């Protein structure tokens, strides 16, 4: 998920 | 965590200082609107408001505090709400019109130019009414749409965001008490507020089952739309 990555960064 | 703590007047400068920016669509095309070119600007354009949609909602007191899992389903159920509510917001100052971005603000006819799509505009049009006819505040406004975060998963999973909804109510009733409305008038407007919840709530499910019947597949929607809309089937 793009949105896991974003949520982290 | 730290939330709980927070002043009413603390919560709100919080949620002002996390707004994300008003972000442009894309100047070409700077033409009259066909329907492969609107859809493209507005998949663009939503594309690049839920990236910082995405960082506003880690800036939203108690929202860091859950588990990666309940901040990925709370932002699943409630990012086009999020979208909705800001667009309302922002186009308080043009009513019949939809500012999308300050060099993309579009009228009612506009929204003809994709099919099903108008429907949507006049209940998104009809919002902006609302707000106009409450003078909704800037700080209200906020706290409306970290309710919305907060609030539209929290059914589908609890203790903590009910606590920072409490809070969040408590702030809005403290806000409405500055203003000097009688306690009578607070929860009269505290419920006229949460009341167009409920209408923004529809506007989503509306919205999300228009973005479904595209795939039509005019154009193609980007990777992270396409993950947050299949989180709704
Ligand atoms: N033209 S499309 O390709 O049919 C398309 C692409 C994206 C969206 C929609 C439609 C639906 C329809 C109305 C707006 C809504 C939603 C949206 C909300 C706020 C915002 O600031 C930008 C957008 Cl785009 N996303």
Same mark, same amino acid.
């Given at each position: 998920?793009?949105?896991?990555?974003?949520?982290?960064? | !965590?730290?939330?709980?703590?927070?002043?009413? *007047?603390? &919560?709100?400068?919080? =949620? =002002? $200082?996390?707004? /994300?920016?008003?972000? +442009? !669509?894309? +100047?070409?095309?700077?033409? /009259?609107?066909?329907?492969? !070119? &609107?859809?493209?600007?507005?998949?663009?354009?939503? *594309?690049?408001?839920?990236?910082?949609?995405?960082?506003?909602?880690?800036?939203?007191?108690?929202?860091?505090?859950?588990?990666?899992?309940? %901040?990925?389903?709370?932002?699943?159920?409630?990012?086009?709400?999020?979208?909705?509510?800001?667009?309302?917001?922002?186009? &308080?100052?043009?009513?019949?019109?939809?500012?999308?971005?300050? #060099?993309?603000?579009? *009228?009612?006819? %506009?929204?003809?130019?994709?099919?099903?799509?108008?429907?949507?505009? *006049?209940?998104?049009?009809?919002?902006?009414?609302?707000?106009?006819?409450? #003078?909704?505040?800037?700080?209200?406004?906020?706290?409306?749409?970290?309710?919305?975060?907060?609030?539209?998963?929290? +059914?589908?999973?609890?203790?903590?965001?009910?606590?920072?909804? $409490? @809070?969040?109510?408590?702030?809005?009733?403290?806000?409405?008490?500055?203003?000097?409305?009688?306690?009578? %008038?607070?929860?009269?407007?505290?419920? %006229?507020?949460?009341?167009?919840?409920?209408?923004?709530?529809?506007? !989503?499910?509306?919205?999300?089952?228009?973005? +479904?019947?595209? @795939? @039509?597949?005019?154009? /193609?929607?980007? $990777?992270?739309?396409?993950?947050?809309?299949?989180?709704?089937?």
């Amino acid at each position: 998920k793009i949105l896991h990555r974003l949520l982290q960064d | !965590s730290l939330a709980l703590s927070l002043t009413a *007047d603390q &919560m709100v400068s919080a =949620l =002002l $200082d996390a707004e /994300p920016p008003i972000l +442009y !669509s894309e +100047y070409d095309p700077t033409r /009259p609107f066909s329907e492969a !070119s &609107m859809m493209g600007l507005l998949t663009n354009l939503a *594309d690049r408001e839920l990236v910082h949609m995405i960082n506003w909602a880690k800036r939203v007191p108690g929202f860091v505090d859950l588990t990666l899992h309940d %901040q990925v389903h709370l932002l699943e159920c409630a990012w086009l709400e999020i979208l909705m509510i800001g667009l309302v917001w922002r186009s &308080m100052e043009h009513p019949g019109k939809l500012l999308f971005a300050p #060099n993309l603000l579009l *009228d009612r006819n %506009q929204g003809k130019c994709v099919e099903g799509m108008v429907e949507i505009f *006049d209940m998104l049009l009809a919002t902006s009414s609302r707000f106009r006819m409450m #003078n909704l505040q800037g700080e209200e406004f906020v706290c409306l749409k970290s309710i919305i975060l907060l609030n539209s998963g929290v +059914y589908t999973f609890k203790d903590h965001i009910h606590r920072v909804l $409490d @809070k969040i109510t408590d702030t809005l009733i403290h806000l409405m008490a500055k203003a000097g409305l009688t306690l009578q %008038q607070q929860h009269q407007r505290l419920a %006229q507020l949460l009341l167009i919840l409920s209408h923004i709530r529809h506007m !989503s499910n509306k919205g999300m089952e228009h973005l +479904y019947s595209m @795939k @039509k597949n005019v154009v /193609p929607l980007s $990777d992270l739309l396409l993950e947050m809309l299949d989180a709704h089937r």
